């Protein structure tokens, strides 16, 4: 796939084997998003000063406002003492019923007081708790069901109504693909973009268009590629001297084949690269003849005047390319290529050499140290623990209770039975 | 430390006295972050339609999916009227006990009704509330214990999987310094970078690598400095006239390995105090002879890059420690001070002004501000948030006293019967 040729003749490396995608147009789609509004339920909550539902909408309505502004005499005598005893007996039995009645009276009042606690003290609070829990739930549910709308208003808030790249909040993947399959382009381009959604998002804009409290609307602006699948290559250059004068080619950057000519992108920011794929922007690009490529082999090429920068003095540096590094070691300066396993493995003499990132890890011109490869470093790890929710339900001894209440009624039943006994021996 | 010399000969100012740090490499570390997951406890809450824990996970699992896609026959008769009298008496006492029994029965059923309210009506609601409160707490604890993970997923979502600078969510200060102490560099650089964490962050990248529901992984890409503590200087230029010429080699310059490195894009160099951090990626290597261009344009040792004009021209360039003024032709220029008092009128030529003495310079009708203009201070007031929790208390002691009083009355009732029985058997 991707390789790299080094031309000692002009001290320069070319990185061949890329495939282009030049932006030459814009595709605009108008996305719209409705608000899942919250209806504030009026009821007495836990704290009268805490109006969460209101304070949450206000917060929102404000953000929306801020954006809007951017646009047998012995028997008788005995039978007498009998009657007398049972009289006294009945007097105590009467007292007993009077005591029990007072007992029951107090108990009754305490039963009334118990209910009135539940009704006047406890019940109102448990309803006030239901209101606060309902309010809270609603607020959290507002923040969940308007997740995207809320992320987008932050994005527009942060960037004053114009963002890039186009986030996954602004435009989801299936929506992006939906838009892609509707663009006026060939199937290969649709396929390409579908495969490089990341790059595509990074070349896109999102411009706030209409914002009202209940609905938000904004144009998404995706790139259109006028041509694709043409050879690209990236040119690196280092100084070149004699062994005296020095020269340096000044046309570094990307090159793409565009309609029989070469497109030249000298600003690094204008080209994105993913694998063997390059995505450039024709907006501020230079058009050159295909003869510029002869400058890689011959400087005094009579078919195109090569752009160079001269020097009357020896000069030395290193340029780090895509698959290695160029080294320009002239004068009394000492250069060395080193390796992570063998230290210094090469000392450069006067001239222009090239080094591959396969065998060399660093290059050292004078006292300056160049890294031909990324230095892999310390792995870091942030551990997490499961979050647990402790819900312990409240249970009442219903059965045990009911058994005792049934016993109470049983005692009452025998009480009426014993009286039916007593009355029956009297005449009913 | 940092000063500024002005060369009238070529109309240009140099800002001497900086110390370099030229990026020539990348250091990459693979950071990973686990999810403090939430196990959804299934139970009936307050609202059956409100499944917060789930609706919260769904929100998250979605975000994670979206990122993934970027990749004695008289006595007898008397004794009879006695028996008849006490008979009637006992009949009413019987009537009495039936009333109390009916009384107690109604009360008993109402005690049952009170309990059944508590168990069937009240208790389930207090449990449904306990569940919703549990659910809520869980969601909030999710947002708190995964704060960092969640901030990172927003960042990658917003920037399509590649951010810069490296936030404090992506890499904390103690982690950054850790990584710095692990880079293959000298103790002097480790000291330098550990001291300029802000700049280091602004020259760093963060590249999403692997994103799964329960764990996130991403490469942090830090800068490596191939050389440091070499003299830097920033050159400004303005037009010079008699035809006109202007040096077109503005920008930063650093002494690099026996040669001069030249950084022509302004964004490529960061500055903090006397410290400069430049990026060698697209830099030009020049011989030390370029520096004579500062004193002589037609210097025989290096052809200076200049831009000419056959007509008079006037402007102002604002340097780091002042400002150059090129006042030629019929244009009138003037320096004023931070009080706007006019302190100097410029004639035909190329002059220099220090930001110590001048605050603004006026070329023609166009106004240059040599210094930041201090403005109106603003203040946003805040007030303490208060949480009012008023607990619910029951009169336990008073109650128990009444119940003990009821039991005393029952006991005395049993005593009186024990008395009555005693007089009978």
């Amino acid at each position: 796939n991707i390789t790299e040729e080094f031309y000692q003749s002009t001290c320069s490396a070319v990185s061949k084997g890329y495939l282009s995608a030049l932006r030459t147009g814009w595709y605009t789609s108008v996305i719209t998003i409705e608000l899942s509004n919250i209806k504030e339920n009026k009821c007495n909550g836990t704290d009268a000063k805490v109006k969460l539902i209101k304070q949450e909408l206000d917060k929102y309505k404000n953000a929306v406002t801020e954006l809007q502004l951017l646009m047998a005499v012995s028997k008788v005598l005995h039978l007498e003492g009998e009657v007398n005893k049972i009289k006294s007996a009945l007097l105590s039995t009467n007292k007993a019923v009077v005591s029990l009645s007072n007992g029951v009276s107090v108990l009754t009042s305490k039963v009334l007081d118990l209910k009135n606690y539940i009704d006047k003290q406890l019940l109102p609070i448990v309803n006030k708790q239901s209101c606060s829990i309902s309010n809270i739930e609603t607020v959290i549910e507002f923040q969940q069901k308007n997740n995207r709308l809320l992320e987008i208003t932050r994005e527009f808030s942060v960037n004053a109504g114009v963002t890039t790249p186009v986030s996954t909040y602004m435009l989801t993947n299936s929506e992006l693909l939906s838009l892609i399959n509707d663009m006026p382009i060939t199937n290969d381009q649709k396929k390409l973009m579908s495969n490089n959604v990341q790059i595509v998002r990074q070349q896109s804009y999102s411009i706030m268009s209409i914002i009202k409290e209940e609905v938000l609307a904004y144009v998404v602006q995706l790139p259109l590629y006028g041509v694709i699948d043409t050879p690209c290559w990236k040119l690196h250059t280092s100084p070149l001297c004699t062994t005296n004068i020095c020269l340096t080619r000044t046309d570094r950057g990307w090159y793409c084949d565009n309609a029989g000519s070469v497109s030249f992108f000298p600003q690094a920011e204008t080209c994105k690269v993913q694998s063997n794929r390059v995505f450039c922007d024709t907006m501020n690009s230079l058009t050159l003849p295909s003869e510029v490529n002869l400058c890689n082999v011959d400087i005094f090429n009579p078919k195109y005047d090569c752009k160079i920068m001269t020097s009357k003095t020896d000069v030395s540096s290193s340029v780090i390319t895509s698959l290695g590094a160029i080294v320009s070691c002239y004068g009394k300066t000492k250069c060395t290529a080193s390796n992570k396993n063998r230290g210094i493995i090469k000392t450069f003499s006067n001239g222009c050499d090239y080094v591959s990132n396969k065998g060399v890890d660093t290059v050292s011109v004078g006292n300056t140290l160049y890294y031909v490869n990324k230095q892999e470093g310390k792995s870091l790890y942030v551990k997490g623990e499961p979050i647990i929710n402790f819900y312990d339900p409240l249970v009442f001894p219903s059965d045990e209770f009911d058994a005792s209440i049934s016993q109470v009624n049983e005692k009452i039943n025998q009480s009426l039975a014993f009286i039916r006994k007593s009355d029956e021996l009297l005449g009913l | 430390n940092i000063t500024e010399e002005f060369y009238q000969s070529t109309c240009s100012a140099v800002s001497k006295g900086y110390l370099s740090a030229l990026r020539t490499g990348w250091y990459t570390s693979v950071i990973t972050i686990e999810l403090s997951n939430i196990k959804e406890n299934k139970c009936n809450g307050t609202d059956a339609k409100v499944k917060l824990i789930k609706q919260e996970l769904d929100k998250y699992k979605n975000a994670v999916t979206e990122l993934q896609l970027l990749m004695a026959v008289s006595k007898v008769l008397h004794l009879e009227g006695e028996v008849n009298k006490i008979k009637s008496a006992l009949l009413s006492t019987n009537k009495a006990v039936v009333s109390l029994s009916n009384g107690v029965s109604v009360l008993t059923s109402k005690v049952l009704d009170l309990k059944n309210y508590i168990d069937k009506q009240l208790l389930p609601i207090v449990n449904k509330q306990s569940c919703s409160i549990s659910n809520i707490e869980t969601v909030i604890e999710f947002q708190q214990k995964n704060n960092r993970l969640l901030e990172i997923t927003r960042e990658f979502s917003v920037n399509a999987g590649v951010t810069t600078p490296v936030s404090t969510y992506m890499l904390t200060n103690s982690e950054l310094l850790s990584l710095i102490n692990d880079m293959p560099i000298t103790n002097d650089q480790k000291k330098l970078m550990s001291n300029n964490v802000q700049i280091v962050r602004q020259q760093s990248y963060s590249i999403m690598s692997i994103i799964k529901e329960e764990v996130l992984a991403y490469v942090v890409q830090l800068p490596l400095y191939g050389v440091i503590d070499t003299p830097c200087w920033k050159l400004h230029t303005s037009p010079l006239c008699t035809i006109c010429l202007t040096r077109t080699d503005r920008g930063w310059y650093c002494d690099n390995a026996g040669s001069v490195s030249f950084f022509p894009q302004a964004e490529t160099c960061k500055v903090q105090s006397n410290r400069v951090f430049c990026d060698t990626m697209n830099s030009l290597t020049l011989p030390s002879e370029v520096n004579l261009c500062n004193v002589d344009i037609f210097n025989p040792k290096y052809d200076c890059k200049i831009m000419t004009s056959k007509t008079d021209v006037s402007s102002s360039v604002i340097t780091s420690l002042g400002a150059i003024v090129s006042c030629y032709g019929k244009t009138k220029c003037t320096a004023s001070n931070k009080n706007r008092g006019i302190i100097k009128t410029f004639s035909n030529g190329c002059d220099y002004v220090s930001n110590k003495g001048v605050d603004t310079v006026s070329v023609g009708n166009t106004l240059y501000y040599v210094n930041k203009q201090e403005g109106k201070s603003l203040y946003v007031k805040g007030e303490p948030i208060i949480n009012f929790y008023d607990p619910l208390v029951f009169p336990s002691d008073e109650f128990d006293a009444s119940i003990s009083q009821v039991n005393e009355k029952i006991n005395q009732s049993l005593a009186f019967i024990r008395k009555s029985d005693e007089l009978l058997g």
Epitope: - | Y7, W233, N294
Partner: antibody, heavy 126, light 108 residues
């Protein structure tokens, strides 16, 4: 060691031409950055810069004394030669030759004479 | 041509004194300024180059200062061997110029 020595006449007759020869070692004018200059000094008076020659055969002269001065190098012999025509008694002075290197760092290019020859005294008299 | 003006011309100070010599250029010359010391009978010797850079070999009690027009040669503690004439020289424009000189004797 970087050393310089000036040879030449001790006595020159008026109107005649003076020729001084600066023999050096420890450095070469083949090396860039290296320069050699000529400084003279009338008895009891201030120093006076006369001529300079660089590695690339660049030559500079005192403006008022330019017409009478000629400097040349012979790097194969490590020698710089100065020529002053029409010598006058008012040209009696001590003639030094000196190496000049340039201050390179920090956007500077300030030439300075780090090494001086002992100096030879040239008297002009009939 | 750029004229150099030293001050004072003559100077007397005891051993240990802090001696302060002034140089002034007819025009601004950045830090293109050198200081030389010339003892009797000998050739001049480099002290300070580029206004404030101390030449290796020269004792640390010598220090240069200044930029633009006004420059300063300084001896922190004058000493018996510091007897010499001190010259300032500009390296800015083509005809290199020295100053009138500053003779420094020693008071004992």
């Amino acid at each position: 060691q970087v050393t310089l020595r000036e040879s030449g006449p001790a006595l020159v007759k008026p109107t005649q031409t003076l020729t001084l020869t600066c023999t050096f070692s420890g450095f070469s004018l083949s090396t860039s950055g290296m320069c050699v200059s000529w400084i003279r000094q009338p008895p009891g008076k201030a120093l006076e810069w006369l001529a300079r020659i660089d590695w690339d055969d660049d030559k500079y002269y005192s403006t008022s004394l330019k017409t009478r001065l000629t400097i040349s190098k012979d790097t194969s012999k490590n020698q710089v030669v100065l020529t002053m025509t029409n010598m006058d008694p008012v040209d009696t002075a001590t003639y030094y030759c000196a190496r000049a290197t340039n201050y390179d760092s920090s956007g500077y290019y300030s030439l300075y004479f780090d090494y001086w020859g002992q100096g030879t005294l040239v008297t002009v008299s009939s | 041509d750029i004229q150099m003006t030293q001050s004072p011309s003559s100077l007397s100070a005891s051993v240990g004194d802090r001696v302060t010599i002034t140089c002034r250029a007819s025009q601004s010359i950045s830090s293109y300024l050198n200081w030389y010391q010339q003892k009797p009978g000998k050739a001049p010797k480099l002290l300070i180059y580029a206004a404030s850079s101390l030449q290796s070999g020269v004792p640390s009690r010598f220090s240069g200062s200044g930029s633009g027009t006004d420059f300063t040669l300084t001896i922190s503690s004058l000493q018996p061997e510091d007897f010499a004439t001190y010259y300032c020289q500009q390296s800015y424009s083509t005809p290199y110029t020295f100053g009138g000189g500053t003779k420094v004797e020693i008071k004992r």
